[PDB]
Symmetry: D3
Subunit: 152 residues, 6 copies
């Protein structure tokens, strides 16, 4: 039974993780199961929480399974950005789901982008959640104020 | 000859404009040509500058031809952004070439994005071109400073 | 003013319609405006509802504007499907937003696909809206029952 | 020689598996080869069939190699579908090649999709292969008939 | 009836042409129809062959309909290539369906690409059709021989 | 500290390698660092050059890290091509970055493609670098001349 889970996991993780991959993983566990075994196995493979073979399954697959779960939840969120100056800037956006987008900006575009993003933070102030969220990062804003004026 | 140019243009603009489309347009003009006619026709169809049939060619195709040329030059530049607040924000980026990318951000991500973009403007100050570019938009920065502190 | 709207519309519709295109259209109208003019112009260009020049704007752009609005609302909905039998079937799915996906199925896959889709209709019966929705198409289901048994 | 095969395999499997990957794998084996060795090595790495090092090559690469071969043969076939009810349904299609497509359907669309898929099974009845194929799954159809009428 | 065909065509051509678009066009004609009218209308709109309104339908839609049909038949065929020298070359491939691909090559890659393509022409010589095909373009090959040796 | 690097690397390599991945890897090393440790760790993980744990990090990640670096440098370069004869040819292009493109060609297209690629080699002769590059592969060209005439 342990071997079959490994083979099925090797198969599903052989291709790029996507938005169906976490549910597809759940289907493999359910196929192998017995509700009591599934819950044991979810704990084992997602959390590494409880034979030698089990340690092997955690090492190969816990991180890929957790990323599948992350993608299910927030795959479309920004994950990383790089920039190269050439005057224009070559920006690369990468999402939690691994997809990337190339975007060129000149100095005027970048400033306009900043203003757009600020307008959204200003709109957050009107919503009860957002205002508290901004206060949660009050120091990061304050850093911005120093940092931006220093540019000026 | 005028009719053939129209048919060839209808064909090439029947599919999405891409990065080969402007050169493909040039090939249609060269195929129809005689260097003296090509230059006349480039002026006619790109600039609308110099029978009834010619006006028809300008109306249908000048804008699609100019967009093809724009894309050739700067298709990968940012062109537009939209945002929807849900606390997270659903952002959509659109480039000059018409391609779009969906990107989710929460309030912390947005602030971090702002800081990254500012760092690039700060790096521009070190390059001789960028510093003058920033001075060219000195008011847009100054607006930012007001606008950001008002948030704080 | 009428000419500028046309040029701006020719530009934005020169590239593929996407999820930002309807808001980008709104921005063109607002840029041209005066709240009273915008509302007049939205009525004119979306609904064709109220000089010669205005008729021209409706003819070229009302349908592309309405599709942009449709995509904004339901671009990801199924719009069309084709199938070619080769035993396997070459299926092509097209969405409201114009994007397509190729999917191969054999006879067993197709039956399994049907069962999956039925399970969802069965789940709809548990939700108050879905049960009434199914009753709204009670004849289409009844047709299915005849149609499927006739196959058997 | 064993080490070189591993390095070359690590390289080719470092990027997403695609439709060229299986032939690219064959090229690595041929590059390392001697027809007699290639056939031994194909048996070893695809089937795990026949030193310690060989077991290592099977464990890391047999499944990725078999998936590459599967994709070569049927990468465009449906592999998985998920659905989320919101009344509309958020469906995700995943193919053997790992590519996915998002498709929204309401209750009417889903029924129409079912009818389309049934029409294809009905067309299969006209082709000599398809009729026997449907008879091969005669129970799955019969299950459908119960299952659909129970909905009604 | 003529107006409805125009509206339906404006809608379907509002989004990028794809592989379902030609069949989707056929569905619009069939929806409007009467077998005798459909055949008249196919002749009218695909071939421009047989009131004022009909001429309008040919002008707006014949070329987009013919491209849809071309794509149905050979959308994946190469349509155009551009190259920019930078020593490396920036190549852009465009297909009949309008999709493009960027591919970088250095001088060695380009020669290797040529050899690969020649091997395929050499394989064509073994197939009865291909040998005659090569003879059909015997002059284009002969031009190559001059042209390549002149490089050497 | 060694364990954290492994976990962070498992995470970033869980998704497809892209153009941001190498810089994202650098960020993980810098986050873990101390300039002296980073340089040690870059040598360790990119070059395998200098406890048991370190060998484990090289085995799992050196190749994926080197591919990320390759992609950063030349991800858009051609990496592989396959062809299937059907008279038309089904070609598949694969880049260093793993992305692929399907392109159909008939016998005439293939010859035209060859001519285009030769024109670029002929243009290279005008540039000081390219002429020497062609001389570097003088034998590969000479092979072409034999090989092409033999076809004729």
């Amino acid at each position: 039974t342990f071997l079959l889970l490994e083979g099925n996991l090797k198969r599903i993780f052989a291709t790029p993780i996507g938005y169906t991959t976490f549910r597809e993983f759940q289907n493999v566990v359910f196929n192998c199961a017995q509700q009591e075994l599934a819950n044991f196995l979810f704990e084992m493979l997602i959390n590494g929480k409880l034979k030698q073979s089990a340690q092997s399954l955690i090492v190969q697959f816990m991180m890929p399974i957790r990323v599948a779960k992350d993608i299910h939840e927030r795959g479309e969120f920004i994950n990383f950005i790089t920039s190269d100056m050439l005057c224009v800037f070559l920006n690369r956006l990468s999402r939690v789901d691994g997809q990337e987008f190339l975007l060129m900006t000149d100095v005027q575009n970048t400033c306009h982008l900043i203003r757009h993003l600020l307008s959204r933070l200003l709109e957050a102030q009107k919503n009860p959640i957002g205002e508290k969220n901004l206060q949660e990062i009050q120091e990061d804003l304050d850093s911005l104020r120093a940092h931006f004026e220093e540019l000026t």
